[PDB]
Amino acid sequence: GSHSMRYFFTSVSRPGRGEPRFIAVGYVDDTQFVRFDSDAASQRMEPRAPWIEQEGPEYWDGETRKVKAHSQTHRVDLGTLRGYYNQSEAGSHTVQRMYGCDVGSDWRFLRGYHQYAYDGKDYIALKEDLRSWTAADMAAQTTKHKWEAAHVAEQLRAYLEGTCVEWLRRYLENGKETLQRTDAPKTHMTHHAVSDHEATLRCWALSFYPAEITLTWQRDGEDQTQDTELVETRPAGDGTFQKWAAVVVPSGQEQRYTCHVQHEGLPKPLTLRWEP
Amino acid sequence: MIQRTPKIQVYSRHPAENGKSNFLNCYVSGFHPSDIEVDLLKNGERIEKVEHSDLSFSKDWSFYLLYYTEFTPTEKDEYACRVNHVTLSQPKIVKWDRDM
Amino acid sequence: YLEPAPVTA
């Protein structure tokens, strides 16, 4: 399958006292492997997957230095943007940044990205071609002119097409026993009477990885969305994911309904039907 | 801020069985801004040893966090998650239901 | 592996 390496950064200003809160997390696919939190005691990038622990001190020192440099950039940006938007010094603001790279099933570079938001709104982002920027407003346009003159896109493109995928490949090999295996959903259907005349069927998908999944209900082999409920895919806390979907049906007609489960770990989709 | 109120799910890691150790999860998502207070409750008392994930966010920039604790369900004990955020006039309490 | 030199906005 295809794979991704992504880094997510959040900085939130603290007008009352001190410097911004800064939180950085790194993922391979849906697996968190590192974190940095400015409030944590270590002041180091920290491992969050066993496979990254085999990297040596020079890796950890370099990642700590770089992550701190990201924190400082975000601090400066919170000040600059407060000025660009004519905002008071009294309020707390937020910057969010995400970037990363994907490789295809062929293990070659597939795409890169780099996106930045201010106060939860798009600010500036690299276009798919990795050569130009999308600026949402005149403040971001000013940033775009700066970055164009500094050849920021050229340097990022070199990282995204080169370094980023080389390291993603390295992590994929070192973490292979988890990162290159799929956990197919463990599925189950429950039944509840909700009145004298209706029942709710709930289709469960448990313990799956990666998080992407499709759960759909069919009545007599046609997709049904009315009278259904879906929850957001949620983390189990052990590295896997959970989801369910439910449908209300006339009592006695349960057998007309099937729940269809599609996942990377399932070579053919699963179909569940209430009979017993 | 534009402001987005959190979605909240309360659930066990494993199917719940009385007397068997498990984890109680409260997944908060879809919120902005990031400052959020989340407690897990046993018969309304705050649970002290609660852990949480590192802040991250989704495609729309909204935040998500998982709060969790080890616990052993029993027939008597009620569990819940209490959440406060700038979008809520007072804290929201969501009780744990075993098949949700 | 992080990118080494984030430029200010």
Author numbering:
A (entry chain A): 1 to 276
B (entry chain B): 0 to 99
C (entry chain C): 1 to 9
Source paper text:
subsequently eluted from HLA-A*0201 molecules on melanoma cells. context of HLA-A*0201, present in 49% of Caucasian individuals. important tumor antigen, targeted by many clinical therapies.
YLE-5A peptide ligands, even at higher peptide concentrations.
